[PDB]
Amino acid sequence: VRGRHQARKRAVALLFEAEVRGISAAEVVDTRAALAEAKPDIARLHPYTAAVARGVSEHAAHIDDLITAHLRGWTLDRLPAVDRAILRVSVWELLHAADVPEPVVVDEAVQLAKELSTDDSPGFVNGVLGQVM
Amino acid sequence: GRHQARKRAVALLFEAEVRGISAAEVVDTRAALAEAKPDIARLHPYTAAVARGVSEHAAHIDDLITAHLRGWTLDRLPAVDRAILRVSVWELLHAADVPEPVVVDEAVQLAKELSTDDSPGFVNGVLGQVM
């Protein structure tokens, strides 16, 4: 585990919450920032979680178009919510996190899929992201 | 309004598991914030009851699920499916006002909306044996 693996995993949970509530991930980040200021001992918000989730919101249509273009016939709505969240996090990093090597971005997506999703999800996300990059 | 309350409980359990904190502690800090900040919305009371309930009865809930997984472990399921089964087994045990078949329907529908194509049939099978 890479230094920011947990921050990425918390960003996947924030994107999932946003989709359940029908609100932007940036709005969920604002709430998490308030919680961190209120209870810094038990509810820290990693700065990278906030940057990833805010970033996905700021670039939502472009990220979704790039994913859809590499889904070989599928629509984004057909994916399981956790795989959609992992791909949105990863595509934001490919576009806007120049310090993270592209192979590292994909390997992190593969590790998130292993930890949170199905056993065929790692190969799926590697395939999609390998084409996006 | 309970379907959306159940969806918010699945999301809360997933975030709690990622954070490594009990779902009751997530509820308690989120509820305290909404009492102090007018701009931050309160949780539906049923979301809070479900999430505190799963924490209170975690060992029993996980044992009942594991007894009907046929050798599979609960920790190896997709995280959203583990959260949906914990919410649903809690309702079978402690939400006496909700008919058992309605609990199963809600879980199958949460699986369809939030998880995999195979998840609805999987949760229907496990819960059909738990009830």
From Swiss-Prot, chain A:
InterPro entries: NusB-like_sf, NusB_fam, NusB_RsmB_TIM44. SUPFAM superfamilies: NusB-like. Transmembrane segments: none annotated. This is Transcription antitermination protein NusB. One of its GO terms (molecular function) is RNA binding. Involved in transcription antitermination. Required for transcription of ribosomal RNA (rRNA) genes. Binds specifically to the boxA antiterminator sequence of the ribosomal RNA (rrn) operons. Keywords: RNA-binding, Transcription, Transcription antitermination, Transcription regulation. GO terms for cellular component: cytosol. It comes from Mycobacterium tuberculosis (strain CDC 1551 / Oshkosh). GO terms for biological process: DNA-templated transcription termination; transcription antitermination. Belongs to the NusB family.
